[PDB]
Design an enzyme around this catalytic site. Structure first.
Site, short mmCIF file in Angstrom:
data_model
loop_
_atom_site.label_atom_id
_atom_site.label_comp_id
_atom_site.label_asym_id
_atom_site.label_seq_id
_atom_site.Cartn_x
_atom_site.Cartn_y
_atom_site.Cartn_z
N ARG A 1 1.03 -1.05 0.15
CA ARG A 1 0.07 0.27 0.01
C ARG A 1 0.99 1.31 -0.01
NH1 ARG A 1 -5.30 -0.05 1.85
NH2 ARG A 1 -5.29 2.27 0.84
N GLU B 1 -6.09 5.75 -7.21
CA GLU B 1 -6.33 5.09 -8.29
C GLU B 1 -7.54 5.10 -8.67
OE1 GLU B 1 -5.05 1.06 -6.80
OE2 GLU B 1 -2.90 1.91 -6.07
N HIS C 1 -1.40 -1.31 -10.40
CA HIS C 1 -1.84 -2.08 -9.28
C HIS C 1 -2.25 -3.35 -9.73
CE1 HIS C 1 -4.01 -2.09 -4.95
NE2 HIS C 1 -3.57 -3.23 -5.30
N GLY D 1 -0.67 -6.50 -9.00
CA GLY D 1 -0.48 -7.84 -8.10
C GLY D 1 -1.36 -8.81 -8.19
#
Ligand SMILES: [Cl-]
Lengths: 342, 342
Positions: free
Chosen positions: A251, A280, A299, A301
């Site tokens: 984060r 985002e 982002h 992941g």
């Protein structure tokens, strides 16, 4: 037969999953962009009885729930955080008798993604690839006078030091990758992280300060909460080697606000690779995107085919199970009570 | 004191190496670009007595050496191949009394670069990075209509099949990374490679057919020689799954010319990651470079800090050693015999 909406699916992947057929008895709309602000979002999901959320991409506020009379179910992909803040106001949901369904997650996709970024950054892959497309052979930039000599050239992992800040399920996998590449792996975190690291045969850094000083690659694997918000300061980052890589796929708010940009501009660490931002989606750019010594991915992941199959499979089955009276996945079971006891 | 020239150092890295100071008693010129023209190449290196080459970046032909009267030493970084191909005419060197010094190589940097490409490709890292920089959030931009569903999103390695073609030092390392990520490693090669793989605990393919058909990621780890040249055909590549990734960090000429372009245009393999090309440097209009499903790096496998320190250290020490009469590094020992006897 419910009216179902899935929010924030940028690449329109959800409707192509094998598991999408689970919702065959229902009317499903998948949105491919994000709408922020209560008004526009409430108008977009006005008729839906069931809402599927993709991780933390959309926050559900009391003010939103006030504008949604037809909503009965929120089904969360992955875990629902019980703590203060959290992207879903569970008490407001419980007040409206809106059940929040909790999924399960997996550490594998974000761990592999972390390592993909480690390798991509240490070998300057995005930089070399982009240069080559523009006709420059074997040029990665990074030749500024403020940067180390030959910083534009790749670096081998074998025999280097990997710092792991946080030893939960993701940290443990990434520590394992480090070991298999022949890196010197050092772990730091809360006491129980240290204990599990020692039990797994990993060295624990002398201190937090020691982790930042010694690591050639430092990767952060912490959940965001009141204890860990801003846990990484500019002082910590500027302790890092001038040739060091800072990785954060966790984060953004784990690092103090602007701390990273600030530290990169002072030359310690030498490079960063990040997967997460404070806001985002990023549609209008960002300071870090204009820095040659930052590699930023959007982002991704958990954006992975097997991960989506598992995540949505569970969130979709959760809706089906609730409609049959199996309420095991309910995060807030006191929302099932009648309005008189609520 | 000799005039020494180092050729083809694109990022001007050689002079910033710690091992560069080994040549402090000499005059060193390092060039930062490539000339292939025999006349232009002769004019550059007209006055030098010692030539240091970077792997196979420059070819040394009989008609080059004819135009260079003062040249006494060719110092090769890495190995010197005695094959019928070979980027140095060793016989011409002997005839002109030029000694060729062989160095030593290391598998670590190219093996790590191979894995960096496997991971970069499987998570569509350059695509996502470049798109984000251009204002597209979470778009890999794999916009073909004939690709498998959701091919634009990432793919975990865990549980997938890793095909390894050739089990020398680099293939052995790459197999180890596959194992570390939870992949099912499948090795193909000659009998003694297959035997070493079985002993190391890896499954082996019964046929070349089986290797191409069953791999989810297929990586090539062969040296180029009279038998392995053009060992991979279009028919091999179109046996790969439409979801598969083909990786080549070894030599372009292992794959039949135009074979990879043709195959990718026919959807099989679905993606490629390639570090090596028939003609290097390449031009911007190169066919593979234009493709969204080919990640192209500019031959960076051996372009790495420790690798350069090692490779150039040996090459520079070799020069020093033969000047003091130690001639163990001489690949063509008969070049030392008198001109009248040659
Ligand atoms: Cl090279």
């Amino acid at each position: 037969s419910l009216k179902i909406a899935v929010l924030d699916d940028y690449q329109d992947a959800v409707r192509k999953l094998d598991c999408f057929s689970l919702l065959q008895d229902h009317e499903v709309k998948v949105f491919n962009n994000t709408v922020k602000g209560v008004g526009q979002l409430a108008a977009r999901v006005a008729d839906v009885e069931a809402l599927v959320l993709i991780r933390e991409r959309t926050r559900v506020t009391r003010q939103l729930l006030d504008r949604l009379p037809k909503l009965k179910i929120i089904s969360q992909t992955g875990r629902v955080s019980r703590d203060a803040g959290g992207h879903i106001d569970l008490e407001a949901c419980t007040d409206k008798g809106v059940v929040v369904l909790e999924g399960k997650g997996s550490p594998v996709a974000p761990a592999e993604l972390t390592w993909a970024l480690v390798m991509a950054a240490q070998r300057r892959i995005p930089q070399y690839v982009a240069s080559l497309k523009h006709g420059a052979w074997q040029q990665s930039g990074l030749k500024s006078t403020t940067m180390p000599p030959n910083f534009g050239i790749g670096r081998v992992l074998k025999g280097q030091t990997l710092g792991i800040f946080g030893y939960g399920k993701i940290g443990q996998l990434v520590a394992g990758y480090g070991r298999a590449f022949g890196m010197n792996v050092l772990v730091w975190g809360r006491e129980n992280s240290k204990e599990r690291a020692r039990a797994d045969g990993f060295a624990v850094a002398e201190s937090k300060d020691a982790l930042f000083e010694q690591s050639d690659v430092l990767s952060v694997h912490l959940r965001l909460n009141d204890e860990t918000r801003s846990i990484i300061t500019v002082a910590d980052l500027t302790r890092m080697k001038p040739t060091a890589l800072f990785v954060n796929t966790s984060r953004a708010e784990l690092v103090e606000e602007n701390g990273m940009v600030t530290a990169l501009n002072r030359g310690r660490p030498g490079m960063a690779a990040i997967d997460v931002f404070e806001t985002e989606p990023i549609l209008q750019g960002h300071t870090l995107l204009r820095m040659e010594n930052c590699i930023c991915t959007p982002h991704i992941g958990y954006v992975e085919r097997e991960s989506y199959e598992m995540y949505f499979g569970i969130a979709f089955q959760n809706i089906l199970d609730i409609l049959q009276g199996n309420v095991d996945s309910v995060a807030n079971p006191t929302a099932l009570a009648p309005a008189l006891i609520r």
